[PDB]
């Protein structure tokens, strides 16, 4: 997801706190002083929930306009071509190679032994903030609620942001 | 930033001094100006430094030549070439001569005298004192070099045992035993110096850097903390840095504490390593803040003033980071007052009330555009970091003074301020205050206004709403609840937070005109495909809602279309291309 | 003060105390413990001090005393009480609570216990370090 029209008074770790809840992130960059960064999820479904989620949403008193845009390596293959207007031949993102039965899309392993039942109701496989972890349904909610109360005491005293 | 261009600028200004053949006192002072400018950006290699030093010596300005050699030495410690230069110069001096040249030899010896290729420094020093008459000082230098593992140490031993035709082996035993230690150590080290010497090669590659063998060497000088340790570990780190892997310095940070070398030796490394390692890396930086708070245990006002200045350098290079202002205001509360509960009760409260009155008038000036050079807080107070300074005012007023009415007064004034309406730590302290004072009436108004006007991040927006739910279910009863759903709006503190969880701009809006204005919104247009605002054709009066049992009464009216021309017209505002690739 | 006796009732609190007694296996301990802090008044602090935070010391289970999240929560129960002044609240914590920890546990407890001290008590940050 390309995020245009930033305040440029905003770090990457505050921007990561807008786009964490929509899914799991394989983040790429925020370029220096350009007032427009970009974010990258692992599910497409997660991205479209983020676009429709935060369109015209003010970050540090500046309405934010966002849309689809390429990654960092493909940017350089564009910026070499935009000056030399030669071809501009794109390359698509690589496929996941379906079908993966474990993974449920738009879901997070909130923090890091598990011998699960592997049943359909539970989430078997998942993504860590790049390692494929087995989520424990009981241990997920206690670790998410662990970091939830930890963040309110650090956030109030300015340590995390 | 073009390091390559300031090199080329120097080489052509230098060549127009040289090939217009004059001093060109213009082309001289322009070369010296571009060399000063580039130095102040950029750390310079010992080849750049040597050429500058060479030229200033050739136009002979002795005292300025001394100052430039000082500068030279402080960016890149394996400057044994530049030490050796500096020592050959200063040997042309006058009347403090004898002791000035002894000083730079002795300082060069303590920066490079333990390096495997350092023998030419010891030889230079010996030459000078022999060219006096100074048989005892010459012998001391021989004896010093002989106790260090140096490359041709065996040749130097031979040389001293024919040159000392005068007293050779007055104590055969001691000198030949420390030589024997030396040559054991030079054999041990010979493995690593050879694994360095047998890739170290400019290939635009990791053999040029020899980074792998340098890491191996650093590890085997840390683990072998054989007391010559303290100096050997620093020497290997600097020889490794001269070919910018910050984990080499972040391995050296651990070695000094384990070895146990004094606070003066350790603090001058990290003061140097902060400038040597590049900006934006920030791994040895934040650790050094942790060191200065830890070395404060032995209360040094030296240790205080390192911290106040390290912040003021880091705050200018990283202005957006809030962690720094929380660490600075901690030490300002700590090292300025130091109460420790061994005082009168009336004494300590003044030490906090002063801390209010200083902090209150500090923020009032960073909003009215007024800077006071006396108060050090005003030089650091930033519009990214103004928030937490306001917070700690509120946190002191409410907790320490037990003062609510002044605290509540301070919220109303600082709520509408543009710098701190959108602040994480401000509202969470408002959340923590409004949680403790039990009331929900003020607190329900907080969360219903949380996506609409009070714009926090979505990870914190969940964090309040998850926690406030648990808190409301725990502390409130149904009678409290039933009176809070007035039903002009569908808002309910149990159900609303689950609906408004990941949605920031969720609005409970019931209306009949939402049915009338449909088909002209961006949700309808960019329906199955997001981003792409197409104009989908459709039949105006669709029959597909009505049942076939009810249609048979009157005949069906013909199909009124709309938007039928734009079946192929697909429009996209390429917001990535026109605002990022085009600027 | 019309506070609904929330998590503190013989019906629920005994379910919670039976939950706390499992200690290592029940696996949702401190999250349950952190919501016992939330009372912020005269009567309820004296309850939760004696009925859980004192009895957990007296029985002296090992698991809870080594986890610094416990000591951090026991400090935050005292500090945010509206009944105490700043003087006794700085006394009662530093004079009595801080010394009751063991010197062996003070290795792994200190990181979470420093964070309480570094934010609310900068003035008495030295007297923390000398103790351990």
Q: Does A79 touch chain C (CB under 8 A)?
A: no
Q: Which residues contact B535 (CB under 8 A, 6 or more apart)?
A: B525, B563, B566, B569
B363 neighbors B390 (Cβ within 8 angstroms): yes
- Nearest to B87, CA basis, from B74, B77, B72, B100: B100
Which of A142, A144, A159 would best serve as a mutation to test chain C binding (most C beta carbons within 10 A)? A142
Q: Which two tokens stand for residue B153?
A: 């140490």
Beta carbons of A45 and A106 less than 8 angstroms apart: yes
Contact yes or no for B338 and C7 at CB 8 A: no
A45 touches B: beta carbon within 8 Å: no
CA nearest to A138 within chain C: C27
Q: Report which of B383, B387, B281 is spatially closest to residue B329, judged by C-alpha positions.
A: B387
Q: What is the largest CA-CA distance in chain C?
A: 44
Which of the residues B402, B425, B480 would you substitute to probe the C interface, choosing the one with the greatest number of C C-beta atoms within 10 Å? B402
C-alpha–C-alpha distance, residues B148 and B232, integer Å: 11
Residues of B with CB under 8 A from a CB of A: 320-323, 325-326, 383-384, 387-388, 391, 395, 418, 421-422, 424-425, 428-429, 431-432, 455, 457-460, 462-463, 466-467, 502-505, 523, 530-531, 573, 575-576, 579-583
Contact A158 B391 (CB under 8 A): yes
Kindly identify which residue of chain C lies nearest to residue A157, measuring between CA atoms: C119
Chain A residue at shortest CA distance from B395: A157
B203 burial level (CB within 10 Å; 0-12, 13-18, 19+) = exposed
Q: Rounded CA gap, B533 and B563, in Å?
A: 14
Experimental method used, please? Answer: cryo-EM
Residues of B in contact with C118 (CB under 8 A): 330
Q: Resolution for this model in angstroms, one decimal place?
A: 3.6
Q: Tell me if B78 sits within 8 A of B239, measured CB to CB.
A: yes
The CA distance from A86 to B211, in Å, is 40
- A with C: how many residue pairs have Cβ under 8 Å apart? 17
Residues of chain A with C-beta less than 8 angstroms from the C-beta of C71 = none
Q: Is A51 on the interface with B (CB under 8 A)?
A: yes
**Is the Cβ pair C27, A159 closer than 8 Å?**
no
Q: Tell me how far the alpha carbon of residue B523 is from its chain's centroid.
A: 44
Q: Would you call A20 and B458 a contact, using CB atoms and an 8 Å cutoff? A: yes
From chain B, the residues in CB contact with C98 under 8 A are: none
Distance CA(C36)–CA(B253), nearest Å, equals 42
Q: Do C126 and B338 touch (CB under 8 A)?
A: yes
Q: Which of B385, B391, B469 is nearest to B427 (CA)?
A: B391
Verify whether the Cβ–Cβ distance B428 to A152 is below 8 Å.
Answer: yes
B contacts of A158 (beta carbons < 8 Å)? 322-323, 325-326, 387-388, 391, 425
C-beta of residue C37 within 8 angstroms of C-beta of residue C76? yes
Determine contact, residues B508/B490, Cβ cutoff 8 Å: yes
List of chain C residues whose C-beta atoms are within 8 Å of the C-beta of residue B399: 79-80, 86, 120
Which of C31, C119, C120 is nearest residue A146 as measured by Cβ atoms? Answer: C31
- Tally of CA atoms within 13 A in the half-sphere of A108 that contains its CB: 17
In this complex, the chains that touch A, judged by 3 or more CB pairs closer than 8 A, are: B, C
C28 inside 8 A of chain B by CB: no
Q: Please give the DSSP secondary-structure letter assigned to residue A95.
A: P
Searching chain B, which residue's CA lies closest to the CA of residue A161?
Answer: B424
- Among B59, C119, B465, B20, smallest CA distance to B35 is for B59
- Out of B391, B421, B580, the one facing A34 most closely (by C-beta) is B580
- Residue B326 with chain A: CB contacts under 8 Å: 157-159
Query: How remote is the C-alpha of B73 from its chain's centroid?
Result: 24
* CB–CB contacts below 8 A, A to B: 118
Instruction: Provide CB contacts within 8 A for B292, sequence distance 6+.
Output: B303, B306, B307, B310
CA gap A74, B240 in Å, rounded: 35
Chains touching chain C, criterion 3+ CB pairs below 8 Å: A, B
Which long-range contacts link B257-266 to residues 24+ away (Cβ below 8 Å)? B258/B222, B258/B225, B259/B225, B259/B229, B259/B230, B259/B233, B261/B230, B263/B295, B263/B298, B263/B300, B263/B303, B265/B230, B266/B291
User: Which residue from B489, B485, B482, B450 is spatially nearest to B466, judged by alpha carbons?
Assistant: B450
Instruction: Identify from B579, B582, B583 which residue to disrupt to test chain A contact, counting A C-beta atoms within 10 A and taking the largest count.
Output: B579
C124 vs C132: CA distance, rounded Å: 14
State residue A40 phi and psi, 5-degree precision.
-140, 115
> Beta-carbon neighbour count of residue B48 at 10 Å?
20
Give the CA angle between residues C31, C36, C38 to the nearest 5°: 110
Tokens of B64: 């300025």
Q: Where are the alpha helices (DSSP H) in B368-457?
A: 377-380, 386-399, 405-415, 424-436, 441-448
User: What DSSP character marks residue B526?
Assistant: T
Interface test with B, best of C9, C120, C123, C125 (most B CBs within 10 A): C123
Q: Are A22 and A50 spatial neighbours (Cβ–Cβ below 8 Å)?
A: yes
> How many angstroms separate the CA atoms of B15 and B353, rounded?
66
Residues 72-131 of A with CB under 8 A from B: 75, 78-79, 82
Beta strand A37-38 pairing with B561-562: unpaired
Across the interface, do C38 and B475 touch by the CB < 8 Å criterion? Answer: yes
Q: What are phi and psi of B483, to 5 degrees?
A: -80, -15
The C-alpha angle B527, B533, B536, rounded to 5 degrees, equals 65
From first CA to last CA, the distance across chain A in angstroms is 22
Q: Which residues contact B468 (CB under 8 A, 6 or more apart)?
A: B431, B443, B447, B493, B497
CB-nearest to A149 from C31, C115, C120 is C31
Identify whether the C-beta of residue B461 lies closer than 8 Å to the C-beta of residue B496. no
Q: Please enumerate in sequence order all residues whose Cβ is within 8 A of that of B117, keeping only pairs 6 or more positions apart, or say none.
A: B80, B151
Which tokens is B26 given? 């213009």
**C73/chain A closest Cα distance in angstroms:** 11
What is the spatial distance between Cα B240 and Cα B215, in angstroms, rounded to a whole number? 8
> CA of A22, closest CA in chain C: separation in Å?
24
């Amino acid at each position: 997801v390309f995020i245009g029209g930033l305040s440029s008074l905003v770090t990457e770790d505050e921007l990561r706190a807008y786009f964490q809840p929509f899914g799991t992130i394989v983040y790429v960059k925020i370029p220096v002083g350009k007032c427009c960064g970009f974010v990258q999820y692992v599910d497409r479904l997660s991205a479209e929930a983020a676009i429709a989620g935060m369109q015209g949403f003010p970050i540090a008193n500046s309405r934010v306009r966002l849309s689809w845009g390429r990654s960092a390596k493909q940017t350089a293959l564009l910026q070499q071509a935009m000056l030399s207007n030669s071809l501009q031949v794109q390359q698509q993102q690589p496929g996941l190679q379906q079908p993966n039965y474990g993974y449920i899309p738009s879901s997070t392993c909130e923090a890091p032994n598990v011998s699960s039942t592997m049943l359909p109701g539970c989430q078997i496989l998942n993504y860590s903030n790049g390692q494929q972890v087995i989520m424990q349904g009981s241990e997920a909610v206690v670790n998410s609620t662990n970091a939830m109360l930890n963040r309110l005491e650090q956030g109030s005293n300015g340590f995390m942001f | 930033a073009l390091r390559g261009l300031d090199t080329q600028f120097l080489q052509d200004n230098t060549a127009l001094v040289q090939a217009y053949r004059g001093l060109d006192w213009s082309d001289i002072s322009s070369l010296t100006q571009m060399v000063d400018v580039i130095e102040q950006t950029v750390v310079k290699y010992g080849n750049p430094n040597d050429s500058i030093k060479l030229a200033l010596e050739t136009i002979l300005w002795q005292i300025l030549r001394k100052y430039p050699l000082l500068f030279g030495f402080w960016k890149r410690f394996a400057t044994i070439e530049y030490q050796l230069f500096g020592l050959k110069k200063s040997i042309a001096v006058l009347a403090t001569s004898v002791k000035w040249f002894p000083t730079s030899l002795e300082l060069w010896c303590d920066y490079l005298n333990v390096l495997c290729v350092n023998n030419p420094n010891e030889t230079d020093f010996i030459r000078n004192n022999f060219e006096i008459a100074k048989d005892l000082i010459g012998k001391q230098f021989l004896s010093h070099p002989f106790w260090d593992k140096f490359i041709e140490f065996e040749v130097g031993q031979k040389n001293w045992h024919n040159v000392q035709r005068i007293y050779e082996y007055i104590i055969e035993v001691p000198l030949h035993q420390y030589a024997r230690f030396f040559t054991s150590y030079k054999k041990f080290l010979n493995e690593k110096n050879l694994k360095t010497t047998r890739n170290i090669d400019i290939v635009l590659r990791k053999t040029q850097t020899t980074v792998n063998e340098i890491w191996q060497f650093e590890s085997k000088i840390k683990q072998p903390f054989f007391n010559l340790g303290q100096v050997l570990n620093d020497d290997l780190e600097n020889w490794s840095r001269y070919l910018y892997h910050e984990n080499t310095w972040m391995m050296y940070i651990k070695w000094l504490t384990k070895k146990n070398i004094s606070d003066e030796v350790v603090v001058d490394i990290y003061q140097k390593a902060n400038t040597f390692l590049p900006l934006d890396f920030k791994t040895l930086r934040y650790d050094f803040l942790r060191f200065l708070k830890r070395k404060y245990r032995s209360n040094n006002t030296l240790f205080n003033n390192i911290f106040n200045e390290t912040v003021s350098r880091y705050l200018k290079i990283w202005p957006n980071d809030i962690l720094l202002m929380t660490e600075y205001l901690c030490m300002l509360k700590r090292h300025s007052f130091k109460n420790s509960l061994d005082q009168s009760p009336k004494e300590i409260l003044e030490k906090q009330t002063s801390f209010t009155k200083i902090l209150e008038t500090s923020i009032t000036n960073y909003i009215n555009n007024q800077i006071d050079a006396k108060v050090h807080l005003q030089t650091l107070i930033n519009d990214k970091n103004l928030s937490i300074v306001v917070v700690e005012l509120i946190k002191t007023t409410w907790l320490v003074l037990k003062n609510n009415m002044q605290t509540r007064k301070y919220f109303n004034l600082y709520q509408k301020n543009i710098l701190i309406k959108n602040s994480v730590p401000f509202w969470l302290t408002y959340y923590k205050f409004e949680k403790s004072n039990v009331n929900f009436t003020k607190l329900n108004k907080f969360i219903r206004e949380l996506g609409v006007e009070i714009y926090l991040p979505t990870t914190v927006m969940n964090d309040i709403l998850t926690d406030y739910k648990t808190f409301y279910l725990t502390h409130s009863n149904i009678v409290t609840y039933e009176s809070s759903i007035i039903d002009s709006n569908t808002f309910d503190p149990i159900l609303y937070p689950e609906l408004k969880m990941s949605n920031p701009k969720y609005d409970p809006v019931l209306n009949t005109t939402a049915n009338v204005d449909w088909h002209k919104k961006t949700e309808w247009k960019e329906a199955g495909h997001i981003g792409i605002t197409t104009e989908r054709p459709q039949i105006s009066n669709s029959i597909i809602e009505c049942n076939s049992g009810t249609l048979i009464q009157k005949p069906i009216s013909l199909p009124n279309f709309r938007n039928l021309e734009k079946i192929n017209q697909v429009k996209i505002n390429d917001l990535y291309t026109e605002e990022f690739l085009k600027e | 003060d019309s506070q609904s006796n929330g998590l503190l009732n013989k019906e629920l609190f005994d379910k919670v105390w039976k939950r706390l007694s499992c200690k290592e296996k029940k696996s949702g301990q401190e999250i349950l413990l952190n919501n016992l802090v939330q009372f912020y008044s005269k009567d309820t602090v004296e309850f939760v001090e004696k009925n859980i935070f004192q009895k957990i010391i007296e029985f002296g289970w090992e698991y809870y005393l080594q986890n610094g999240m416990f000591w951090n929560c026991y400090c935050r129960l005292i500090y945010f009480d509206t009944s105490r002044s700043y003087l006794d609240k700085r006394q009662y914590i530093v004079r009595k609570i801080w010394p009751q920890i063991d010197k062996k546990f003070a290795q792994s407890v200190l990181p979470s216990l420093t964070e309480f001290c570094e934010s609310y008590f900068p003035e008495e940050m030295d007297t923390l370090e000398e103790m351990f």
